[PDB]
Amino acid sequence: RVRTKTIKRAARQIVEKYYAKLTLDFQINKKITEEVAIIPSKRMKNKVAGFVTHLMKRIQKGPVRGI
Amino acid sequence: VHPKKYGQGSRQCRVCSNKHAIIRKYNINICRQCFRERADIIGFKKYR
Amino acid sequence: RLLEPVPFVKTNNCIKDVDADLFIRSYATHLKLHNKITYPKWCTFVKTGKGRKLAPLNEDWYFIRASSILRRLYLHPDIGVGFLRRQFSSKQRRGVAPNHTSLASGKILRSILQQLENLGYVEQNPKKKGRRLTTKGENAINNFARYINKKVYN
Amino acid sequence: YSYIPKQNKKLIYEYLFKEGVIVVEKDAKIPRHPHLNVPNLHIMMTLKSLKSRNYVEEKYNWKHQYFILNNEGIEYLRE
Amino acid sequence: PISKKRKFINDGVFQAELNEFLARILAEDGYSGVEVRIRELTSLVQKRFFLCAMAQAESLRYKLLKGLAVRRACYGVLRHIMESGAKGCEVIVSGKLRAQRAKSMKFRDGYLISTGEPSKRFVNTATRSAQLKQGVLGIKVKIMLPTSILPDNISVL
Amino acid sequence: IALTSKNLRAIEKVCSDIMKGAKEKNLNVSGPVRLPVKTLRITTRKSPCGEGTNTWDRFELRIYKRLIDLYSQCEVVTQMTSINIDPVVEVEVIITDS
Amino acid sequence: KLNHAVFIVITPSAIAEKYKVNLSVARAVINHLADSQKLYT
Amino acid sequence: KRVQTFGKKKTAVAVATVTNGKGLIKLNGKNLDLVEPYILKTKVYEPLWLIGSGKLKNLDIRIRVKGGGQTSQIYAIRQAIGKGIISYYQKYVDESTKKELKDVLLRYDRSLLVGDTRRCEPKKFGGKGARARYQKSY
RNA sequence: GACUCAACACGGGGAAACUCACUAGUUUAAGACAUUGGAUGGUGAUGCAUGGCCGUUUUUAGUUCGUGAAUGAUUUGUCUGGUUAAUUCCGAUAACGAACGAGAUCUUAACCUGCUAAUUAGCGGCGAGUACACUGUACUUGCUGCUUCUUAGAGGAACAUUGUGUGUCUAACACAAGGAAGUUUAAGGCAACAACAGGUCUGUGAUGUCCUUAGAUGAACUAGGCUGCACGCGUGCUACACUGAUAUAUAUAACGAGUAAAAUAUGCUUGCAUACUUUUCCUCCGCCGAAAGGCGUAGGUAAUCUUUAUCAAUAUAUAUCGUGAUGGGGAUAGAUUAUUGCAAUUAUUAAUCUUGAACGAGGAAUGCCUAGUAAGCAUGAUUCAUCAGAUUGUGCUGACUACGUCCCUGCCCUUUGUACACA
């Protein structure tokens, strides 16, 4: 399924500014990513927000390569 | 002269001046050879 | 095997509540016994349809069509001459050429329609141009439907 | 034969003059033009003849001529 | 008394006439618009019926037809596109080009999206052709209008 | 009053104008009618020569038609539409009483 | 080839093999004994 | 009082009107046994048993037939009647048995309550078959 | 014209007058311009002069830049390896950072906003009932509470979501559950870098150059071939049967597409000239005729009329037959009734009958096939004066199977060897 450089760099770009409002729940993370984002394609916004969720479940349990 | 209102010689292409491969669908009477490039100027797009 | 268990409540008020094949055969026998129409002899040497290309081989096909025409007339409030042709359209294999659907002959159905018109079972009016069945025919077919239903019930 | 009476030539000339704008159609066998009550076989030859005399220019198109009176074409063609 | 279905194809025929007529008549300047010079145009039209990519492409076609070198003409026109505002321009010219062997030169600069329906919607096209002593020249000018925002263009403030 | 076109937003905004005018003039205006969108499909093949893998492409025409009705004077509406219509949109006016 | 005739379980296939008869005359014999393919009563 | 629901699998359609009455469950004009094929009649009988003949005796269902093949029409009728009984239990007759009825319907299968998206795809290129190609020569 | 994929139901090519670039022939100037001077057109030649277009490589994933770095052609970036729809990424990295192609995005099917409503659509209510139930029903005719249902404007839902797991614990994928949606939910269209001496100047008043022009290589007119065959090779249709040959009855859809002329009368002497409606599409009707087809007509420039509360078929049930090339089979020609076409003869199209070939499921071999999909069954559109057995759009019958691999084949990378570079 994977993703592209656009998603991989959007995930790095976001979080670093509004991670506090980010929560553990997938749907709430979807909502915050959607409202901060401006990209008008909901499908790939959902894809990038799922990427964000799987990157947030990596936090608080070891180094996460940036952020 | 012997002009007839029926058959292949009843009408010819309105642009390409050749009556072969005329499409009469929807009463266009334009030859397809030119219509391939006339599709966009008429505004008749290809999507799928 | 013809009768089957039914869980819902029946009404038994018309031929719509009875199966098509049993009613059409019962009414073919009814008209054969009553002698209301002719055979007719002129239809004998013509097959049912152009696509059929062969004799039906049942000796009562005209009466079966006579019992089914008004059966479809009750079902549809308005019909046409081509309606029967389309309903009884059959396969036609033009030799080497492949099969296509084709309508049956229209003169025989026109003639039997004239026969029931003479019988009075069907009427024509400027309004509702399609064929409809008259009020007397309605109660006649209703009584016949309930009359077969009562024997086939118990 | 198809001899042209002078009436056709003078009529087409004055029809150029009064309208200022003129189209004569590339087809040749049409008996009559929607805005011209004159056979169209005898107008294509005259239009091409006048064009070849360097008095009118023709942008031209497929099955269309788009003729127009030049600033110098009227004066010679008056009489 | 005509249907809408045949009416719209009659209108399509009318616009087929109009596109080529506008292409022929609009030669000395850009695209000044259409009406629903002017006096003659209206008279002929009524008689018969009863940032500018096209302009820039016609300019380059004129520069090639006048006998000016393709390299310098293309470089100049590309500079005018860049200073007009398009993020880039894809211009390709084909023909004999001084030899008996067919050839083409492609000038690449910038993003230059080349396929996809959003690309087709954002990017406008121009392709012209003209005669030459021993052949015919073909020029293609692809101008991309500034980007709503592209889905790939992502940034967070 | 029925309007027909090919593109989407040009008739949506005109119908929005119809609705806002109806609300402003408090007319006996019936609800919007959403006719099915009809599509017309023709065929044409690429490869102008005879050789090559013959390929066939399909273009579509998406016709549109939406109806409304109002109980008012025809002159005011036939001016109001011409005020805020586009050349690519066509309308036909039919009046009603109740 | 066939050599079945009409002159001398109730399923037609079984009784046709039993009596060495054609299927049509087998159906006729079944009707005679009792008094397209169908299930049993 | 009354409820109106819908059911569509494949090209066939079905609209079901469920109303109080004496059990006049009529498919337009014809009854549910006189269709001719008993194979589909068994499937039509299937949802009746899971709910109750005594319960259905108190309600009339007006069922309309329009379009589709035999299997498609029977599936659409089954969806229409399932949604009708579920909505009527949710609305008028009784809520306590609605949960049990919907649970048993879900357990038995998924196609009884809501149909399937399985449909015909637009024809691609290559052959007469929807995924076939012409027998290329050599 | 075209010669493996990349031709051989292709040139839209289902060829009765031109039509056709061809033939037996007959005509015209219709050679613009200033006897004569003097050109356009051309289906003549050249796709080995071209443009555009297309068909391939090639539906795969490759191409390029700036800088840097390693006499030169050049190398790196563009990669050990792990994942993938793909240099798609993770990662070690003389590379780092960029542009393309990929991606992504959208129709349609698909679930929902008891949103949003009603034309030409649906659900109801009552004014009068046709007959029965019983203390409403199958069907009409007139009006309107309302719009999930006939339809659709935007939007949302779906994101490996969650949980049990593998993984350099990073990038990933598996099962199950919620969920219509777990291979991007699936078919599609856009198709680069670069090339073919592939096709097309027979598609263009797009097209250079050599060629014709009064006895035309311009145009028009009579007849003919492309439809003939000693034969060979492709795409398809019908079949070789009893799950079948055949007749009756009922249960059935989507895409659909649809209006410079007929006839009447007058003059002259059926023909020409003149004016009136619109006859110039599908057609429902009532008849004529088995049918074809005709007659006077409803409707409609179109969810209104064809016609779609309905257009087919394999099915469903009973019947003649009951696996014998048979009555399966329908090649073949003969007798003809009507339409299409001023022209059906090389019997177009066609209702009827007779005529009765092979065919026991097809060898060496090949093509298509991963789920409304194989396969079978049909239907609409195109070119049409008439004619699908062609191509395309749609619906029905819903299957046998994997859910991966390089052993065949076609492509790709790396390494290596070359005396190949038109490779």
Side-chain angles (χ1 to χ4, degrees):
Chain A
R1 190 135 62 236
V2 299
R3 86 310 314 176
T4 165
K5 270 284 194 245
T6 296
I7 317 300
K8 293 270 217 185
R9 67 198 168 81
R12 161 219 42 87
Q13 180 50 69
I14 69 93
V15 169
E16 78 177 313
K17 208 188 311 272
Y18 300 120
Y19 166 67
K21 183 61 158 162
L22 295 175
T23 81
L24 201 76
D25 208 59
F26 161 78
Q27 271 84 13
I28 288 82
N29 274 337
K30 224 89 171 171
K31 283 321 116 195
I32 163 161
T33 41
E34 273 170 282
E35 38 85 11
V36 295
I38 62 152
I39 305 315
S41 167
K42 49 173 260 275
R43 211 83 293 174
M44 51 66 58
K45 291 326 286 187
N46 268 348
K47 186 87 63 70
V48 74
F51 198 106
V52 178
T53 299
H54 85 58
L55 174 152
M56 308 339 288
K57 55 174 61 86
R58 195 166 139 190
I59 325 295
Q60 80 108 31
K61 43 100 152 165
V64 293
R65 184 35 209 96
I67 313 170
Chain B
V1 299
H2 277 43
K4 314 303 146 190
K5 296 325 201 296
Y6 97 107
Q8 333 99 33
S10 49
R11 26 74 186 92
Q12 72 158 167
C13 160
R14 221 276 211 185
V15 47
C16 93
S17 79
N18 195 341
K19 44 78 170 201
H20 271 306
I22 271 156
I23 65 155
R24 293 101 28 84
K25 184 174 195 76
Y26 294 174
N27 315 118
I28 166 177
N29 204 66
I30 268 58
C31 171
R32 52 198 331 262
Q33 310 276 156
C34 293
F35 140 76
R36 307 168 214 294
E37 43 269 13
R38 302 316 139 73
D40 213 45
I41 61 158
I42 288 170
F44 184 20
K45 83 194 200 294
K46 42 180 317 279
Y47 170 84
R48 73 169 172 80
Chain C
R1 192 176 190 278
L2 313 174
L3 266 283
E4 294 297 340
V6 173
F8 61 84
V9 171
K10 294 172 173 167
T11 57
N12 300 312
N13 42 10
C14 191
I15 64 185
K16 63 99 173 165
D17 272 351
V18 84
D19 35 28
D21 297 11
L22 290 204
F23 175 78
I24 63 147
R25 293 325 304 252
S26 180
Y27 208 47
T29 65
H30 199 94
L31 217 72
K32 202 164 202 180
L33 197 130
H34 278 46
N35 206 246
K36 281 210 167 182
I37 58 164
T38 79
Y39 177 44
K41 55 105 172 176
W42 89 278
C43 185
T44 330
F45 65 100
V46 178
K47 76 219 85 180
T48 51
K50 290 91 60 187
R52 269 87 176 178
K53 214 69 174 164
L54 206 64
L57 189 47
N58 52 316
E59 306 304 309
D60 200 75
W61 92 77
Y62 191 87
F63 271 60
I64 304 154
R65 312 291 203 122
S67 185
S68 196
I69 166 176
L70 82 162
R71 257 273 307 105
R72 288 310 277 199
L73 259 303
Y74 157 71
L75 165 139
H76 209 281
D78 279 28
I79 61 107
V81 189
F83 213 122
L84 296 75
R85 291 182 84 176
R86 287 175 300 232
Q87 183 93 16
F88 310 137
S89 184
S90 181
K91 140 177 114 158
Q92 191 183 351
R93 311 163 57 161
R94 300 88 23 96
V96 69
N99 147 78
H100 298 79
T101 184
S102 269
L103 323 167
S105 269
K107 196 142 177 196
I108 65 105
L109 56 95
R110 164 151 35 75
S111 74
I112 170 78
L113 200 43
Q114 297 156 351
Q115 288 266 341
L116 300 323
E117 271 150 10
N118 269 316
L119 275 186
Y121 279 113
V122 278
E123 85 284 22
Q124 56 280 61
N125 300 108
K127 302 304 166 59
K128 314 162 31 173
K129 176 200 64 188
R131 293 321 201 260
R132 84 211 71 81
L133 84 84
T134 174
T135 304
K136 81 96 174 185
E138 178 267 1
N139 56 67
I141 214 65
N142 253 35
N143 207 14
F144 281 157
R146 287 186 195 71
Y147 145 82
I148 74 173
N149 288 14
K150 295 314 102 198
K151 44 198 103 79
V152 308
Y153 203 55
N154 298 322
Chain D
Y1 271 73
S2 310
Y3 262 122
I4 321 164
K6 302 324 120 182
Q7 51 107 37
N8 194 349
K9 296 159 191 272
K10 63 166 224 155
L11 158 63
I12 63 168
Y13 288 170
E14 70 199 324
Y15 145 81
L16 321 183
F17 291 149
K18 59 198 193 37
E19 266 299 332
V21 318
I22 38 162
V23 166
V24 289
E25 196 33 75
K26 190 39 75 162
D27 207 338
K29 269 325 109 181
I30 174 158
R32 206 84 51 212
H33 179 257
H35 291 186
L36 276 165
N37 53 0
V38 44
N40 295 310
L41 155 70
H42 296 283
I43 212 178
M44 270 313 323
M45 274 259 299
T46 42
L47 258 301
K48 199 60 72 72
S49 291
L50 159 79
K51 184 179 171 186
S52 196
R53 254 180 161 86
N54 189 25
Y55 295 123
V56 56
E57 73 98 353
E58 186 207 1
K59 168 62 60 156
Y60 179 83
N61 199 24
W62 49 248
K63 320 303 194 152
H64 262 100
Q65 300 318 103
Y66 193 74
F67 267 100
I68 184 74
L69 263 307
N70 188 28
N71 286 22
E72 202 261 1
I74 290 178
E75 303 310 304
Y76 165 85
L77 207 84
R78 302 165 301 201
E79 90 212 10
Chain E
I2 322 291
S3 73
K4 63 211 171 320
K5 160 160 146 169
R6 272 152 82 179
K7 154 163 51 71
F8 219 97
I9 268 173
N10 291 26
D11 299 341
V13 152
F14 306 150
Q15 310 147 310
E17 320 303 320
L18 199 60
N19 165 263
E20 50 97 13
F21 283 142
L22 291 167
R24 300 263 176 142
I25 69 179
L26 299 193
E28 81 273 3
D29 65 338
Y31 264 47
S32 185
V34 295
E35 57 84 12
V36 182
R37 198 82 280 144
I38 273 300
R39 153 192 147 210
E40 294 190 70
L41 161 142
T42 312
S43 64
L44 272 307
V45 156
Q46 283 190 347
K47 269 282 155 285
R48 303 290 63 79
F49 281 166
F50 303 94
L51 301 75
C52 303
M54 182 46 257
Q56 291 317 112
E58 215 36 51
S59 192
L60 199 278
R61 211 263 287 168
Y62 295 154
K63 304 216 134 140
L64 311 193
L65 204 69
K66 291 150 69 182
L68 171 77
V70 188
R71 271 78 32 179
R72 304 161 260 211
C74 167
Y75 299 159
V77 161
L78 204 67
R79 305 319 175 258
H80 323 124
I81 310 316
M82 292 326 148
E83 83 176 8
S84 72
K87 56 212 147 183
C89 211
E90 309 158 19
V91 311
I92 281 82
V93 276
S94 275
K96 295 289 289 181
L97 62 149
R98 277 101 190 180
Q100 223 169 52
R101 198 81 251 160
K103 242 157 252 176
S104 151
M105 59 309 283
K106 301 97 179 167
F107 322 72
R108 185 161 211 131
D109 33 32
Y111 193 107
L112 299 194
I113 187 66
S114 52
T115 179
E117 53 187 278
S119 181
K120 308 320 291 160
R121 307 165 167 163
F122 285 0
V123 183
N124 83 356
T125 165
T127 311
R128 307 290 282 209
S129 183
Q131 194 176 8
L132 166 152
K133 173 257 150 200
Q134 209 187 19
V136 50
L137 73 147
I139 158 195
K140 322 174 158 72
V141 180
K142 259 303 211 192
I143 291 198
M144 325 76 86
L145 283 200
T147 187
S148 305
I149 72 107
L150 200 79
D152 192 54
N153 275 84
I154 63 104
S155 184
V156 167
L157 263 306
Chain F
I1 290 96
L3 83 170
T4 53
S5 276
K6 294 324 210 271
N7 42 82
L8 198 276
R9 322 303 314 197
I11 71 136
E12 298 215 300
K13 60 189 185 68
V14 153
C15 188
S16 286
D17 301 326
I18 292 293
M19 302 188 191
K20 63 153 183 197
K23 304 189 283 239
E24 161 164 51
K25 296 146 199 56
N26 57 260
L27 317 158
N28 195 3
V29 166
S30 192
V33 195
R34 315 215 198 279
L35 262 299
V37 168
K38 287 119 179 209
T39 164
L40 286 200
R41 306 81 39 207
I42 76 105
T43 52
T44 190
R45 63 113 204 79
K46 272 302 152 179
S47 281
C49 201
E51 77 148 23
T53 305
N54 272 331
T55 169
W56 266 132
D57 45 47
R58 268 73 211 205
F59 324 145
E60 81 291 16
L61 304 121
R62 321 178 180 230
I63 318 93
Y64 219 155
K65 57 212 64 46
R66 312 284 231 196
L67 186 100
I68 210 74
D69 221 342
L70 53 95
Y71 184 24
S72 91
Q73 167 67 31
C74 284
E75 281 289 322
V76 297
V77 284
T78 199
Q79 300 324 118
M80 181 45 145
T81 41
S82 199
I83 272 178
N84 197 3
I85 55 145
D86 309 354
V88 314
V89 192
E90 49 266 13
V91 87
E92 190 266 299
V93 162
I94 36 185
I95 209 175
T96 184
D97 186 69
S98 188
Chain G
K1 83 286 183 193
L2 317 94
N3 67 91
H4 297 178
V6 80
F7 194 74
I8 59 179
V9 70
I10 206 172
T11 80
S13 310
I15 61 103
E17 303 321 292
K18 275 167 177 290
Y19 278 163
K20 282 154 45 189
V21 304
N22 191 289
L23 264 174
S24 56
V25 297
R27 284 158 73 229
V29 166
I30 287 158
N31 302 339
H32 156 51
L33 179 138
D35 182 73
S36 75
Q37 288 196 43
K38 45 164 301 205
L39 263 73
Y40 323 109
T41 82
Chain H
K1 174 200 179 176
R2 69 99 182 184
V3 76
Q4 185 181 356
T5 88
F6 58 100
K8 301 98 181 198
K9 322 166 58 191
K10 306 173 75 159
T11 315
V13 83
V15 49
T17 290
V18 188
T19 52
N20 314 277
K22 218 89 162 191
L24 285 88
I25 306 105
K26 323 294 279 300
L27 180 131
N28 222 26
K30 203 85 143 150
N31 314 127
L32 306 152
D33 165 68
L34 289 59
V35 56
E36 201 143 348
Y38 330 115
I39 313 105
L40 67 81
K41 188 224 311 196
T42 44
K43 208 59 56 163
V44 163
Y45 185 97
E46 282 204 357
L48 195 136
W49 158 62
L50 277 83
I51 314 180
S53 53
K55 167 72 224 77
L56 198 44
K57 203 194 172 180
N58 313 95
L59 303 173
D60 298 357
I61 324 168
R62 284 155 144 271
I63 317 160
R64 313 290 101 171
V65 47
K66 173 195 178 172
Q70 36 256 21
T71 313
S72 63
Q73 260 304 110
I74 298 312
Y75 279 164
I77 291 318
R78 288 176 345 137
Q79 296 326 285
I81 66 191
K83 182 173 163 64
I85 182 69
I86 286 299
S87 179
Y88 213 85
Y89 259 60
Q90 173 60 44
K91 269 205 165 187
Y92 286 112
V93 268
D94 46 334
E95 322 288 321
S96 88
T97 323
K98 187 240 190 177
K99 284 312 151 153
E100 158 63 61
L101 158 67
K102 72 180 300 295
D103 168 88
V104 81
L105 283 184
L106 166 63
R107 165 64 264 158
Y108 171 57
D109 48 357
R110 195 47 198 68
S111 295
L112 269 186
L113 55 164
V114 177
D116 189 357
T117 295
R118 176 63 147 245
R119 293 280 201 130
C120 304
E121 290 71 46
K123 182 43 146 40
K124 52 88 149 187
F125 260 53
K128 288 302 198 263
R131 196 77 72 235
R133 290 124 212 94
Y134 301 10
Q135 309 331 289
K136 38 194 306 185
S137 101
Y138 274 143

